[PDB]
Design a protein around this nucleic acid. Sequence first.
DNA 1: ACTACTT
DNA 2: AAGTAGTTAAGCCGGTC
RNA 3: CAACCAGGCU
Lengths: 147, 30, 49, 181, 49, 135, 266, 391, 56, 114, 65
Amino acid sequence: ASRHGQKGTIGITYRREDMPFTAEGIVPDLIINPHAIPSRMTVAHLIECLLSKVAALSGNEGDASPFTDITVEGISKLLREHGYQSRGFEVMYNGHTGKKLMAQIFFGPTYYQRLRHMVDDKIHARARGPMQVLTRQPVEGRSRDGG
Amino acid sequence: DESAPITAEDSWAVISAFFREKGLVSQQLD
Amino acid sequence: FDMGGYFIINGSEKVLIAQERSAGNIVQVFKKAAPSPISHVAEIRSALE
Amino acid sequence: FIVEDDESLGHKELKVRKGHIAKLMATEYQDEYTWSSLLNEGLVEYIDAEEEESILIAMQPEDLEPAEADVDPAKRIRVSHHATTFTHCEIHPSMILGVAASIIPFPDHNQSPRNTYQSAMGKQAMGVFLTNYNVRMDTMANILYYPQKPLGTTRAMEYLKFRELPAGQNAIVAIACYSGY
Amino acid sequence: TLSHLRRTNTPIGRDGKLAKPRQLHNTHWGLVCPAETPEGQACGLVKNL
Amino acid sequence: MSNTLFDDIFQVSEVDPGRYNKVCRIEAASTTQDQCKLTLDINVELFPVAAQDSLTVTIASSLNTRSWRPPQAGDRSLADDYDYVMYGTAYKFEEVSKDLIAVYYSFGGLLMRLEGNYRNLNNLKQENAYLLIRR
Amino acid sequence: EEGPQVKIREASKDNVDFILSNVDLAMANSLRRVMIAEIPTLAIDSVEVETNTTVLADEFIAHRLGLIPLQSMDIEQLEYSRDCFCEDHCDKCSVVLTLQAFGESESTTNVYSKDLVIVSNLMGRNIGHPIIQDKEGNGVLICKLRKGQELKLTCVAKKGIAKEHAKWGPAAAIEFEYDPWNKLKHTDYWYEQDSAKEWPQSKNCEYEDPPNEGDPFDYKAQADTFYMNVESVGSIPVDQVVVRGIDTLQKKVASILLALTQMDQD
Amino acid sequence: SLHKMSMMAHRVKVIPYSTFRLNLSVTSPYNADFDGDEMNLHVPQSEETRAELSQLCAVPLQIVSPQSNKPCMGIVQDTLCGIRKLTLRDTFIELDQVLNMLYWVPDWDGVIPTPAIIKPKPLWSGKQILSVAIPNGIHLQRFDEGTTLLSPKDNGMLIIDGQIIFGVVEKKTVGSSNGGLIHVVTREKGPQVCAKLFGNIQKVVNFWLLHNGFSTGIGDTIADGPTMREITETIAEAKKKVLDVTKEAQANLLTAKHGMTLRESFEDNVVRFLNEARDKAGRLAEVNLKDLNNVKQMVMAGSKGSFINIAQMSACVGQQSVEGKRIAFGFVDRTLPHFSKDDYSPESKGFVENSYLRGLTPQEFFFHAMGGREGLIDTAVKTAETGYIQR
Amino acid sequence: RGNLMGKRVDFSARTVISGDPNLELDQVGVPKSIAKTLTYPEVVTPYNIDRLTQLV
Amino acid sequence: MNAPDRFELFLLGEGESKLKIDPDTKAPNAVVITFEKEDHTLGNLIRAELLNDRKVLFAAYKVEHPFFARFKLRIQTTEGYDPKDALKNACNSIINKLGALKTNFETEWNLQTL
Amino acid sequence: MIVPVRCFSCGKVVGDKWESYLNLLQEDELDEGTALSRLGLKRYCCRRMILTHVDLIEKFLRYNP
DNA sequence: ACTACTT
DNA sequence: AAGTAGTTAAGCCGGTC
RNA sequence: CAACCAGGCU
Ligand SMILES: [Mg+2]
Ligand SMILES: [Zn+2]
Ligand SMILES: [Zn+2]
């Protein structure tokens, strides 16, 4: 999860050869779907990226503190200062074909938390097994092998 | 001018002094 | 870095959670419902501090 | 902060002044002029809820004080210091928040609820809860291999010791539709 | 560990739900966090300083 | 029917690109019948178009069909004596009262409307229909 | 020469900016990728811990010993343990490194990519040498330790490519770009006011003739001339990550012919 | 498990990796999202038992639902947002790739269909290939707004003998709509044919979008310079449209609307002003955002977010409220201790003038919170309360 | 209410779900480890005596 | 846990064969070929080239589903000309081109310094 | 918590550059911003790597057996 | 909370 | 007319007796 | 194959 009630689970993993990329070489670690932003209305995410793409470049701990005198405008200008598109976007190529991507993606870093709760500690299955004693029904709990 | 006003950033220095003494779990202790 | 503020009972790190409630000894007036032989009320819960 | 109009050289004004501040960063650097001092020297005071009722406050120390004698189009839009009854000033609004919300970047840019989530989800992440994990025998426990502090930050962090014990990493993220996974 | 050390409980009641207390008050400003409270269940009953 | 089904030249009244980086719906009248009006979306990237223009419009059901083949036609038949030939299907055969009948053609998106009343035994309502433009 | 030409712009020991010209985008990318993931290298792949008191736990360390690049010049004459017949492994399929550290200094003792000691016979061939580009000649700080913290391991580098796992990768980044002045319209620049104003033009805008209005849209426009740049990690020389790339991708295409062959008989 | 559809029969397809993988159009029925949601699976046991599932409750059958005589599954997210772009006249596709798209459709009669454009370069239209997914005889006619048999705006929708004749494709067409491409294919060709249609449609669109790509980020949230200023005054003026009604009520010169107090009738007028303004501030930006704007594209397709979304991101958040009444005087005759008593101005009863791009002010922030905190509550109430009812 | 009108049952499985744009609407990706847990009693028949012995 | 073995990405598993050719029925003189333990790298490229042989009426390729290392390639050619051969050629071509591109990149490299 | 060997994103060795960076700061009184450009870390994927790493290991070593 | 029959 | 019991969403996952 | 108190996740 990001830092904006933006939880999500992996679905697949690809290696660099398949990941999309920017002519400069860099490629992504994650690829989240544009759709969970317009409705969620979690702009902070967006901003954190722009500010962090910079802070990463300039090497100056970006200040994303609450009420400050910062602005996307300021941040955009300073990113333009390093030669990269002003809003964040960059053009990327499709790792399969190498052709360009008709669109430009919102590339740039973002702090993501790997939270507890991983599939393998859940995935559970049962076909006949331990049975309760009073009820003679299946016991409860994957940890006890119940159904 | 050890008596001029105080602008934004200054706030922090104070806050720093706060937690310096007090400390995030103050209440539980006291 | 540990900031303490907790206990260590029979082994495990226990934390006493803050309990909220209405401050004692204080007067307050409250209105009543439509069906009520009473109009308003003056309450004061007295507790020897 | 106390603002008593004690300014026999102007208007109503903050007790504490650039000197006090510099006399603090003084002892800060030395790691005598503490918090306790700011208190006893009647410069800052503890105002509870009830008493809070009968007072007036200024958010921004500055901004909300000097007179009115252009305005940035990119910045937000604040009201003003329309009054002079200001008896106290807010050390800094950011402090309304709490440990959780304090790590949230730009919370003043999210639809409200979105922040209540990050508030209990962050309590489900991983990092380095202490430095002596190696010596502790707690039932269950997780430590992220290579923790990185965050790129984006908060002045609140500093005291919560976030950068020395982060809880995540900085991922080169891309926002786009791909395989469709 | 920090955020747990600054947590408060607020006894429920029979006619629970309502919002008399589950609501975010003005008086609350500066003292209790506005955003941090558990989703559903005891929402707003458990506050964080 | 390997034989044309309509011919003329119109002059571009006005060409329009409403929110369309690479396509423009255009219109012009016949330099013959003052009945033959025309509407046609055009890929103005693979054939630019500026108003007031001598343009030849054709029809026909061939080019001298099935699994469309690549070129190979380095030397094959090719009613391609133009510089923009589409293909589509005829959907509507509307009757603008009187003796004036208009037909609608769509080429996978790009639409078109014709006017007059002389393709009485020509503009069949068939799917077939390669559109052609020259000059 | 004959087909797709090259014309190395800058060049060094850790990069080969060059211009791949007169090729199909397909091929350019294909090569791009081959470099990234299918070029054989050599890396530690098995770690036998005998002793460890550091603060880093066994596997933690192991994991790392994997990324510690090793010499893979003649990797093309060593064998894939899997294809060799020795029950498990041998000098013919692998290199054996060693590590032993003890905190003597009263001051943090540091373990480096250098302290690795080959033990197996390299039957004479550049392979298994903890590649160092470090200025002081120590490379990749494996781990630190206190007073009497010991650490005795044993490593066994084997062949292996990237698909199998990253550590066997040799490339690490690879600049790739073409048609700097969007001429084939392969993109659709996003903007507020101006495409040109807001969107930075690249170093390669030079090496290619700017647009110039007037002219109609070149739709017959293909796409040759690609401004690449194959960096390297060490394991193999920048030049190699490109030749061996060009080769492997070739042998790969080869096998497909060969397969088509045995196919005939039956 | 709320309705039939929360439980359906699927075909086992053993795959690797520890997670249950399901198609997406069937995501909607269960109410399933992937933030880490779980799903249970029961295995039939008798020959006749599996029959009941395969014959009575297989997803294909559950497609057109009786809950509300219309399909309950349709195109979503990517596939959807992406099917729009694949359609627009503007969008042309060339051979080399069309050939791949053709192949990807597991039915395709292996008969490359003639490009609409043969002329200089043989070009194919989005709609064109997309239509290779749509079976035969499926007949459809829409007519949105300025629709016209030659629909300029590329409106409504006309598909004949299973081929798209005109108009873009999005939610209203390929969604779980009433006259749905789906609602029709189902009734017309069978619950099977339709079942596979989701498939085909997806695999093409999905694939095409893979290479056309799509995205979003801040850049799509800032409204044009003047359209912003133009808004800052739409706000401001409503500010005074308020100020007045305020003094005009401090002078005691206001007709208490029959049945309402002066105060009752007062707020009422105020509010209607703010919001009224708010929406306008919004709309302004809404139309100010050009077609290339991602956030808008998504709204167009119908794959995410709507008006009020763009509004609060780019324009102005709006007046926060609780129990109907805007923020109240919990602090004796005021909102916070950062206000002088008896102040009624918008900047105090909870009107957020700033947008999300801009950034709320402390007050703006806290008030918003009080507002949210209410939703989060009845959300946790209107839930269990619902639960008991549904039972 | 909790034993008769509803109960815990055998031959059931459950894990985290994730969308896949590559499965026919009506399919459901099942992890190997789960397919190998869950079973189905199938009667031996001249129709399947072969396939079945193979599996056994 | 239910994770496959990384190497299965390229090691033709017991009794599998890089190539497998099955004749398409839906259309005349055109065939579908399954490449095992391979991917885009090889595919797109063999697909590209095949797009030159003018006697090749159709050519496309698709990776069935990420999880699996493999792709189907469909090639259709003019009568009398057998697709199998078409594949063959475009293969060689690809090599030949590469050969040159190898040679040439070396030339360049030798005439260099630093 | 020891310097990550190689960059998560592009894989460019980065285990060596630790001490060096730490000095181009302490001794060479330089600014991180370039101290990195110094060490050759061009694009951010790698920058972010060093710039952010938190060498906890030290605090760990300061313990005992 | 909220409804019924008790208090 | 107050009072006083019952119903109060659903499934999965540490501490004493 | 226990309960009872308690706490947490969607
Ligand atoms: Mg969920
Ligand atoms: Zn061997
Ligand atoms: Zn990197």
